């Protein structure tokens, strides 16, 4: 009865941080939800009852979160186990930690704690186990991801890939992560021994949903300098074999950035992830009680929509969201703890718990976090972020990009407000 899995929640993508400082990666919401519960519901969709969540940092936050989850309840089916250690600073370090601890049985699943997907692996998982058992126990990995656009907005310029594949075995002939490049070379230990017809494809994207067995565990007991999945799969290519699995049905990807986070939140609300839809309200409270309407818009509890306040496309709102009149909001998410003035236009913005905003704050393309305040006529420009009790007064026509949070040396304010020191 093969049903095993394991989770990880550690990255270090220092391009568009310090959002990972006090509300870290592992409790970053979409609309007052848990992304780890998105991964966790996906591994309920696997059919596996056993998982092992990896903490990165702020373990007491996981202690409070998973004590009020669905899975705190011992009556629940899909049990979640946990590791308690703050000494560890990579991807594969905790992997070889749990594998020297050696409580991992067989043919499991590793995935990162950001991934939202809805593909049932049991049409491809048992296919992997077929390739394992009937053929030599050597095809040790099958990473699995989705047929895509030749240029999609959720495949951004820092994580784009291109893969040479077999004609029909779907085994990897070549993989290369190609950030910071414009042209494409190819290694040649895969071409005349592959006398079957070579398939090179440019339309896929890499997402870390590795189903694998503890032969992989021994293959990174082998090279202690291995840290990531990238040098695993590139240590495959030096000679214990790998396939891929492309599909034509679903959407599975990740983010460590903010950019394809905005893309995947656009994918959630116009619902490229059905069955998994945020109005079935799979996590258990009444603090997410919103319905449907025209144009895929959603209205929670204590709505209070303003007179003439049109609210057209692809948004929702949570609890305690007082809305003023004559506002105009499209393709975005307002979360709970919200108050609105008048003419408060939002566009592709993010308004998490406790936020406030004054009237006339004409703001486009934001990303904004816990219990923040912003005053009248703050015109604000795309690709910026605000975090953790910001206060900005009147007549700031703030520029394009400005990370504004409590840290001096990287964020562009200090422990006081963000106009001037």
């Amino acid at each position: 009865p093969p049903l095993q899995a394991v989770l990880v929640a550690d990255s270090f993508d220092r391009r568009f941080f310090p959002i990972s400082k006090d509300q870290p990666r592992v409790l970053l919401p979409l609309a007052n939800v848990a992304l780890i519960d998105y991964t966790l519901e996906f591994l309920t969709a696997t059919g596996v009852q056993e998982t092992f969540v990896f903490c990165c940092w702020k373990a007491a936050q996981i202690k409070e979160h998973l004590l009020k989850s669905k899975w705190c309840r011992p009556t629940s089916l899909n049990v979640v186990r946990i590791i308690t250690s703050e000494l560890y600073r990579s991807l594969g370090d905790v992997l070889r930690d749990v594998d020297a601890k050696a409580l991992v049985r067989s043919d499991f699943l590793l995935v990162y704690g950001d991934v939202i997907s809805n593909i049932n692996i049991t049409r491809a998982l048992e296919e992997h186990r077929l390739r394992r058992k009937l053929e030599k126990n050597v095809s040790v990995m099958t990473m699995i991801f989705k047929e895509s656009s030749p240029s999609h907005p959720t495949r951004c310029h820092e994580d784009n890939v291109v893969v040479a594949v077999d004609s029909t075995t779907n085994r990897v002939l070549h993989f290369q992560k190609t950030q910071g490049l414009r042209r494409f070379a190819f290694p040649l230990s895969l071409f005349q021994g592959s006398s079957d017809g070579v398939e090179v494809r440019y339309d896929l994207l890499d997402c870390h949903i590795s189903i694998c067995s503890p032969q992989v565990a021994q293959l990174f007991t082998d090279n202690f300098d291995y840290q990531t999945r990238d040098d695993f799969v590139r240590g495959l290519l030096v000679n214990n074999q790998i396939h891929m699995h492309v599909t034509a049905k679903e959407y599975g990807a990740r983010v460590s950035n903010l950019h394809m986070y905005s893309a995947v939140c656009a994918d959630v609300i116009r619902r490229w992830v059905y069955p998994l839809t945020p109005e079935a309200n799979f996590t258990d409270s009444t603090t997410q009680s919103c319905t449907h309407s025209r144009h895929n818009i959603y209205r929670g509890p204590e709505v209070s929509l303003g007179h003439g306040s049109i609210l057209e496309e692809n948004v929702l709102l949570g609890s305690g969201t007082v809305i003023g009149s004559n506002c105009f909001i499209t393709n975005s998410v307002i979360g709970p703890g919200c108050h609105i003035g008048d003419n408060v236009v939002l566009d592709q913005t993010y308004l998490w718990q406790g936020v406030r905003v004054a009237a006339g704050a004409q703001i486009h393309q934001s990303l904004l976090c816990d219990n923040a305040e912003v005053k009248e006529r703050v015109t604000l420009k795309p690709r910026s972020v605000l975090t953790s009790q910001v206060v900005v007064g009147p007549n700031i026509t703030l520029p394009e990009g400005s990370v504004i949070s409590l840290h001096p040396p990287d964020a562009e304010e200090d422990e006081d407000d963000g106009e001037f020191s």
Partner: protein, 333 residues
């Protein structure tokens, strides 16, 4: 107007007899479907010896003997008007040709190929848009493809174990382009300057990919010469117990002369104990009484007699011996 096509006189006549002088073979197969206006460009004393050919037409143009292959084009340019379905020497003609030329009609590119049954050509999963090439020797650099040419097309196929066919379905603007750029010869290697992505004639370049085999091009190619294509009508014997062969007109066929995948030429005196071949046997022959054969193309004026010995070694023209034991290496015969 489309109706121009010619075989190249070189590949890259006198010797390569599969069963005929080889240029006889593609001419009846291009004349198979139309082309009552056609040229046969020669290059030499082989220009006016075509009484056995029963033409509707020919244009026998001689040329210089020492040349390449675009020299023919720069020589023949004051006589052509339209589409050029140019052929060459060492190509099989064993396949449908109508679908490649109406593919040239169908998908509005200037060119087409036959790519049918150390070489890496790039075709799409649609299988009609070729992209680029790689070979066994020139691509000693690994292989590099460019960004936009692979960003406009998301997936690609590499047909690998497959030969060139030396086929070209090309129209007039490339040939007067070659008159302008008269520098680059070697039409087999003029297609790395293809420029799908970037202008004196938004431009497209395609090809076509039954799947039988092709001939090796060094000098002989007679492994394709053993061809049972669709022996017909001659003066026969009804005494030779032999099948999968061709009869010999104006020849001496009798009994005791077996030909297993062979033929009988003109004045082939095979009526005593001749042997089965798995090989070729041309005209003016007299080979029997144990004239064994294996891998042995017996050319014109053939002689192997009195318990002859030959195995895994071809023969040529000007042989007159009885006990000349041809060893299993293909030796000078």
């Amino acid at each position: 107007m489309e109706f121009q096509a010619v075989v190249m006189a070189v590949g890259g006549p006198l010797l390569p007899v599969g069963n005929k002088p080889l240029i006889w073979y593609p001419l009846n197969l291009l004349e198979r479907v139309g082309f009552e206006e056609v040229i046969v460009v020669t290059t030499k004393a082989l220009c006016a010896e075509f009484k056995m050919k029963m033409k509707p037409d020919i244009v026998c143009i001689p040329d210089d003997a020492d040349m390449g292959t675009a020299d023919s084009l720069r020589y023949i340019y004051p006589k052509l008007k339209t589409d050029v379905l140019v052929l060459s020497c060492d190509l099989i003609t064993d396949v449908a040709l109508h679908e490649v030329v109406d593919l040239f009609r169908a998908y509005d590119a200037s060119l087409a190929m036959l790519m049918r049954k150390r070489d890496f050509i790039g075709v799409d999963s649609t299988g009609k848009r070729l992209l680029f090439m790689a070979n066994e020797a020139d691509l000693d650099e690994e292989l590099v493809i460019k960004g936009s040419i692979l960003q406009k097309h998301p997936r690609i196929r590499f047909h690998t174990g497959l030969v060139d066919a030396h086929l070209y379905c090309l129209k007039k603007y490339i040939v007067d382009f070659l008159m302008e750029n008269g520098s680059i010869t070697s039409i087999r290697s003029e297609l790395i300057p293809y420029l799908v992505r970037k202008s004196s004639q938004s431009l497209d370049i395609y090809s076509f990919i039954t799947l039988n085999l092709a001939p090796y091009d060094a000098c002989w190619n007679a492994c394709r010469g053993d061809r049972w294509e669709d022996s017909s009508a001659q003066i026969v014997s009804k005494h030779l117990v032999g099948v999968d062969s061709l009869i010999g007109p104006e020849t001496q066929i009798g009994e005791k002369s077996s030909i297993k995948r062979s033929v009988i030429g003109s004045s082939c005196l095979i009526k005593d104990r001749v042997t089965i071949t798995n090989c070729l046997l041309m005209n003016s022959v007299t080979v029997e009484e144990g004239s064994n054969i294996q891998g042995s193309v017996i050319c014109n004026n053939a002689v192997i007699e009195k318990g002859a010995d030959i195995k895994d070694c071809l023969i040529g023209s000007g042989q007159r011996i009885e006990a000349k034991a041809k060893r299993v290496n293909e030796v000078i015969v």
